[PDB]
Write a protein that binds this DNA or RNA. Structure first.
Ligand SMILES: O=c1[nH]c2ccccc2n1[C@H]1C[C@H](O)[C@@H](COP(=O)(O)OP(=O)(O)OP(=O)(O)O)O1
Ligand SMILES: [Mg+2]
Ligand SMILES: [Mg+2]
Ligand SMILES: [Mn+2]
Ligand SMILES: [Mn+2]
Length: 532
DNA sequence: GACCACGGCGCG
DNA sequence: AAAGCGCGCCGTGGTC
């Protein structure tokens, strides 16, 4: 039954706020409230009232801190019950669910939100009493990380807009040429973007063999894997693949990115969602800057668009074979430890076995292999017979015997405890491990043993970001992007070299393992340059 | 306009 | 597509 108390609130109050739209960098601050000591404070003018707070503590703290940074204010995020709930159970991803689950309702009014924040925090902090590992992750990783992300989000990254505009006009001309071919070959026009219309053309009119069907609705699939299986079975398939690539990059990146430049900053701002994934990874959205193309020649042209402020350079740091090293440490496989203790590369060894484009393939291969891929799909990818695909799966695990033993212990443990955990104790609940439908059970198993490996690499990286960020600010350098095992920094030209050495070392020393973490670093005027 | 399910595909 | 995992956004297609 909170009481209206005059703004401002006492120091250390829980904040509620309402935004015109989810994106902090783009939102209007509609309302701002705070709660403390059995009272609620509703600010008369939200923007002015921001100045009174000294830290944002409450649901979605980082977002409001991001909006504060955009206004020239340094209001860092503090406690956020979402981070508590997320650590308790990573399926806790939204305030709607968290409130439903731990004792309130997520409404649209800042006061009730500030109130909700306060009681949700009490209750969750209660639930976390005694979970000392999760408390450690909260204090040493997540809560400090929120500040770092708020700064990355507010900073943004520079984009060569004029370049992409020109690229759009070029690519559009290429697409029209391929559309025309496809339409001719099909003997009539139709919407090449409609997978439904395409399917009737390929499998009914052209009478091509229907490899596979789609998951939910059982239509005949027109996916790249299926089209690749028909690249020589007919010429029109080939062009379809190329129309898909261009339209995919044009409509997802080339055309939308330029129109998202912020007016005040002149830069492009993503959101780094901190309670979004089941393994502990971050995600990026609005726009997603974690899937900017890079694997093909055209995508590379897109990456070139991401450039440094004049007088600065981008610094790109990227852990080598990160999840493999984690697997060595997690499992104890001596043969795999040695692989890394003596500077061996097995992403390059799976390339010649099966340059920069051939190494990306061995990356899809050795990772697909490792996480329970099927002999069937491996045979199909590598273009070899099923007989040969099983032997790359026999040897790939013969070499490193303790991995399978680790997989088993992990699954056995997740069955008893109902969850699996990373090196630091981050939990993921995986209930279907005792499912009586084999398929459902074995999916769960693949989810279960991947988590500690992907989630440990994410713990390490978050920790590296937490340690590295203070050093960058004191050097006048900036942290721009994180792509799971990678960081892009922006540095004044004359500090760029020292920043790279420093960041490389911080990341490599984040938390020593039974195997060394190695980092590749590069420096350049654009994101593509910085990774050569 | 808003929403959503689906197939599809980009990156890690 | 199939016994890899984790995401977010696209166009289409359908509703309200
Ligand atoms: O689960 C998959 N499937 C993948 C397919 C292609 C590429 C990576 C894949 N990964 C994950 C594993 C790891 O978390 C991260 C490493 O990211 P990448 O930088 O791409 O690879 P890498 O660390 O093995 O080696 P390298 O840095 O010398 O290139 O990506
Ligand atoms: Mg061209
Ligand atoms: Mg989906
Ligand atoms: Mn990488
Ligand atoms: Mn890497």
């Amino acid at each position: 039954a909170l009481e209206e108390a005059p703004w401002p609130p006492p120091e250390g109050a829980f904040v509620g706020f309402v935004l015109s739209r989810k994106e902090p960098m783009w939102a209007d601050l509609l309302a701002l409230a705070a709660a403390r000591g059995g009272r609620v404070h509703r600010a008369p003018e939200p923007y002015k009232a921001l100045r009174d707070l000294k830290e944002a503590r409450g649901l979605l703290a980082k977002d409001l801190s991001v909006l504060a940074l955009r206004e020239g204010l340094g209001l860092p995020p503090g406690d956020d019950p979402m981070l508590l709930a997320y650590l308790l159970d990573p399926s806790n991803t939204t305030p709607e669910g968290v409130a439903r689950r731990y004792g309130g309702e997520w409404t649209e009014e800042a006061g009730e939100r500030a109130a909700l924040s306060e009681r949700l925090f009490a209750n969750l902090w209660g639930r976390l009493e005694g979970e000392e590992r999760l408390l450690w992750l909260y204090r040493e990783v997540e809560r400090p990380l929120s500040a770092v992300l708020a700064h990355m989000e507010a900073t943004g990254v520079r984009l060569d807009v004029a370049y992409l505009r020109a690229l759009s006009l070029e690519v559009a001309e290429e697409i029209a040429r391929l559309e025309a071919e496809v339409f001719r070959l099909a003997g009539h026009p139709f919407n090449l973007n409609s997978r439904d219309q395409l399917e009737r053309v390929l499998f009914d009119e052209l009478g091509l063999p229907a490899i596979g069907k789609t998951e939910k609705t059982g239509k005949r699939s027109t996916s790249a894997a299926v089209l690749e299986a028909l690249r020589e079975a007919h010429p029109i398939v080939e062009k379809i693949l190329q129309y898909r690539e261009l339209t995919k990059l044009k409509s997802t990146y080339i055309d939308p990115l330029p129109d998202l430049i912020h007016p005040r900053t002149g830069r492009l701002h993503t959101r780094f969602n901190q309670t979004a994934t089941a393994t502990g990874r971050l995600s990026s959205s609005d726009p997603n800057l974690q899937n900017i193309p890079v694997r093909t020649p055209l995508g590379q042209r897109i990456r070139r668009a991401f450039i440094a402020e004049e007088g600065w350079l981008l610094v790109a740091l990227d852990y080598s074979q990160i999840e493999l090293r984690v697997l060595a440490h997690l499992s104890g496989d001596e043969n795999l430890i040695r692989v890394f203790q003596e500077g061996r590369d097995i992403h390059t060894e799976t390339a010649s076995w099966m340059d920069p484009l051939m190494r990306r393939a061995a990356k899809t291969i050795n990772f697909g292999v490792l996480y329970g891929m099927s002999a069937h799909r491996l045979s199909q990818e590598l273009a070899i017979p099923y007989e040969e695909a099983q032997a790359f799966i026999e040897r790939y695990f013969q070499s490193f015997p303790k991995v399978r033993a680790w997989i088993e212990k992990t699954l056995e443990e997740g069955r008893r405890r109902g969850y699996v955990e990373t090196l630091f104790g981050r939990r993921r609940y995986v209930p279907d491990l005792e499912a009586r439908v084999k398929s459902v059970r074995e999916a769960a198993e693949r989810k279960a043993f991947n988590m500690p490996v992907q989630g440990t690499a994410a713990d390490l990286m978050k920790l590296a970001m937490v340690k590295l960020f203070p050093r960058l600010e004191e050097m006048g350098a900036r942290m721009l992007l994180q792509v799971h095992d990678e960081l892009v920094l922006e540095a004044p030209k004359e500090r760029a070299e020292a920043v790279a050495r420093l960041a490389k070392e911080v990341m490599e020393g984040v938390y020593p393992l039974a195997v060394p973490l190695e980092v590749e670093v590069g420096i350049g005027e654009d994101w593509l340059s910085a990774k050569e």
